[model samples]
Target: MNIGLLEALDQLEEEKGISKEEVIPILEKALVSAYRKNFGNSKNVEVVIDRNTGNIKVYQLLEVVEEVEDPATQISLEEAKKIDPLAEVGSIVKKELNVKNFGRIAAQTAKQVLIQRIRELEKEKQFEKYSELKGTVTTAEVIRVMGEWADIRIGKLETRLPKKEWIPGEEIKAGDLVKVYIIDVVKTTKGPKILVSRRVPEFVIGLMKLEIPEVENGIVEIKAIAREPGVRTKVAVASNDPNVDPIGACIGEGGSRIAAILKELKGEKLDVLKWSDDPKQLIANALAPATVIEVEILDKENKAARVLVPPTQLSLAIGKGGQNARLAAKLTGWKIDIKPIMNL
Candidate 1:
């Protein structure tokens, strides 16, 4: 039945873009649920759906009897005759519900629908807002840095940067803003739980996508990225468009573009390398500042790569505190065990 509630329904349609037709069924289902929540458990209730006019009716089934034995589940034949003149003893009846009382019922159902639907709308907004940012870096301000976790506000949402995902030695304080990559988003019952990162390989790639037009426009694709956060990063890039010099495009005019990213990362050294398909050549290039004489794949299943560097280059291969080797392992997607040429 059309009541004054149509104005409110129209407002919801205007604001949320939900059709008036969709509201009816949700209301019908919600009405039955509201009834069950309020009425006795023994009473069975069913709400009928009307798609065309967005109309709904509530029925309370009662056993027909010559006398009212159970007031809750039974109606006297005299009272039943008023609504349905043909309703007989021992037969079920459908009493026409007055629209005035349904307003209260509709109000209860509407309260539930509004609360639930608002949560859904918020979730959709979050997904669309972040999914478009899949490969981009965003600036977020740290609100609080608790043990192993920092709460950062991204857009309108308060997202978390867990300790393991942060740069190992960086001192994070309240009110400090940092650049973070949108790594992943997971939908949950509560809402969307967005997983952010600073230590992961893609973090740098995301930064490249934002800062470098070549990477953003698909002229250059960062094929491989490995980072040790505060210390160093290695990225392998290739050109999709043959006309673009991928390395030159990334380095920009006199190292301007790459320098911007280095400053954002607080002076972390970044090595931009051209990617090669050949595993041996790739491993050698990935080994970096360390010159390799020979390499072996002892275990492919375990992703272990053994690189035999020139005897005097052991220090370069391992780097300071093994940061270089660790990043190499991350870049190559292999667990590289470095050995000097003398041992080989």
Candidate 2:
């Protein structure tokens, strides 16, 4: 039992990332419960397990009194002297019980209690580890696919990754290694529910943080993001230092930085633009690839803007489903109306 107990502690520490010291208290509690179940009601009982040697010792505490009234909890002064030389009236004495004498029922009770505590600790460990990673990206191994959802293995815990959270039309199968953004870690009745996503705006932001050193270092800040999921996404960025161009830093030399991010999104178009306090400048930047002839603030109070684009680029400006104009409006926090100029 001694060697087996030590080996179990070693395995638990290695596999669960929980120290043997942490489990000792719980193990001791289980032993106390087991002792009570086996030997009848005994509040004076305490279980001690040596941290280094894995020696399990059960102690029954008794008070040394002038005349013992209750033999169960009180030891006579003459008898207490045999255990402790300094035994006096009102002194407490601990008597170690033979652990081998514990019945099968006691061992079973201890095992059940230890197993229950281990399960509870596992959930707590998972909750704490994943909670810190909320709104961040992590690599997950696809364990199993169930219809619309995939079971992703993050560390030792399995989390549900819904189809809606995945990039639109993206196929995720078992044994695939995929990067995911942690949206939330919720405590459910069963255990910690780690909610992860791939299509959310924050996912792109997290991707940029990983691919672009400037974003991770806080030299460049992502101000806002307007996404169309699988289609296109417009990101607004600002620089902390005056000399640094946030957009250029994110774009990298020859578009390598943005290209790396695009590959992960499965060729999704990403427009990295500089953020401006002036709504007019922000609107023009947001409506990229479409040259704007002019931008006029239609209403200050309503935050509306009227933009004129060259006739040839009207379709590009409006996008396939007016998505570009819609995303521009959202990015700039203004209502946008696009008017095309015709040659007379």
Candidate 3:
């Protein structure tokens, strides 16, 4: 009767990756509950399934005694021996039950349990897959926007990207494809919840790694990154191989590589500069697009610096709202005091 059941288990293993070994014990437990509910809630009933054939059997565990006190759980030695020849006064005997006698409701209960268990296992597998993607970047499609949240689909999961995580002033709409950094992947009762972001500084670094082969291959290493999302970003990079130009490599031929990164950044400004061991030079480079006359270390211990730019370039060095100087200070880990050079 259960030959077809065994075949179904094999098919499930093949199609759904749910092994028979994993499902068999669950199937037995469900059957046990069904049997108890249908057979007057007998406490001594046990359910077993033949692993090889999927043949299920229900048994009443009756203990042999000198005299039967309860017909439900105890049997006289003489009566127990009728079922098992070795049954003694202290021995237990199994009385096989006809499972075909189970009512339709009991059968339905067992089926539901199996289906629920399989669904749970499938969800667990999906959680594991997404968990491996934490701290990485992936392209996602925006499904829809509702007020302050966007529903984004990544692979097989849909996650909500809060407006705060979006690039400042960036507008996202349905069906728009965007690149996002996986900030975290958490397992909740429902399933895996993925937290993604487009505003973090790491997102720019991730895009550089994705677009620049040198960075991915370890030839061009990103030493530091500072970003004001949707506004400007400052990247400090260095070359492991002296022959390779880190800044030029990141910019690509005719700015092709950096252009791709900028496109994903929604036209945000990017400044890729060389990392330097000299604090003065590093600080000067960090404040790019604004020519600096000199960088003087004010206090080495506190990492404070005084930057001198031409009078005409002072405002540019400070940037709009001092964003350039602020990001330069962040990228170089230095306290910068930018001022126009005064004629001595």
Candidate 4:
């Protein structure tokens, strides 16, 4: 019955990543189901899978009995002997049973099994596509929550949001519009389950593209992004066009451009700084809203720096909660100490 099915299975293997070896086991299970549904009282039905190629075959094993009271479970010894001369009373006889030779209801049973198996394959293909969509931002709505995890409806699929992935102090509830990044793909018995994050560095990059044209046009590159996850983000930008100022373009007039992003970040601050070959200069810029008098560095062994700013500029340079300085430390891998300028 499954002679030509091998070609179909091969196509499934190549296109859907389905194993050719699974065909027989599925068919064997299907046959078992059909046998029970159609011939419930009969103990004669047996389904077997081909060892070499996984094709399915069905057989009827009936015991030859003298009385032959049960036609399905037992056959007359004289009738069995006519078919197999060596058959004796109370002995078992094997006979091939093809689905093509079955009745209308029996054939319908086979169709149901085939349809159900195909549906399982379709789900697997969808999982493969979803698994590869990691790292990109996907907009979804919160559908339900389980502890720190939430289930979101993204497109036609449902994605999971673990609590650890949520931005600090960010509110999430049912029907809320949210963007998530695929952090991990876990293959499970049910399907490919994905772990999404709102706290990843790419979350800011993806959001920045919404507001920054240079980033979208590839003129201003986000060379590196170090995020403190819901608190602060430090993005390093380099300009391919000297005519286009990377930092200014990102900041916009009066910080209007970057401010939009901060609003979405729930008041999280931003430090848009110029990239420099000199680590000290970049570090100084990273400690933004603060005016620096001099940046003195003894060594970068532990990535520490002693930055001297005017006494009045100290507060601005440190930013609220040392936000700017802390982001600078994260971006440059440096431990910075903001000090007021004093006579040596």
Best of the candidates, TM-score: 4
Best by lDDT: 3
lDDT of 4 by residue, 166-224 (tens): 88877788888787777766777876677788788888887777678888788888776
* Pairs that clash in candidate 3: none
**What TM-score would you give candidate 3 relative to the actual structure?**
0.75
Q: List clashing residue pairs in candidate 1.
A: none
- Between candidates 2 and 4, the one scoring higher on lDDT is 2
- In model 2, which regions exceed 4 Å deviation? 2-116, 342-344
TM-score of 2: 0.70
lDDT of all predictions: 0.78, 0.84, 0.86, 0.75
lDDT (Cα, tens digit) per residue for candidate 2, span 1-344: 32356566777778766677877787788778777766767547988877776667788888899776888789898899897667889887888877566645544654665577688887887899889999998889999988889999988778889987899977889998888999899888788988899999899999999888889988999988898889889999999877888988998899898888998888578899988888888899999889988888989889998899998898999998998999998878899999897652
Predict model 1's lDDT versus the native: 0.78
Question: After aligning candidate 4 to the native by TM-score, how far in Å is the CA of 240 from where it should be?
Answer: 2.6
Candidate 1 stretches with Cα past 4 Å from truth are 1-22, 29-73, 81-91, 94-115, 118-129, 140-148, 151-159, 173-176, 218-224, 236-248, 251-256, 266-268, 273-318, 325-344
Candidate 4 scores a C-alpha RMSD against the true structure in Å of: 4.8
RMSD of each: 6.5, 7.5, 5.2, 4.8
Give the 10-residue window scoring lowest on summed lDDT in candidate 2: 102-111
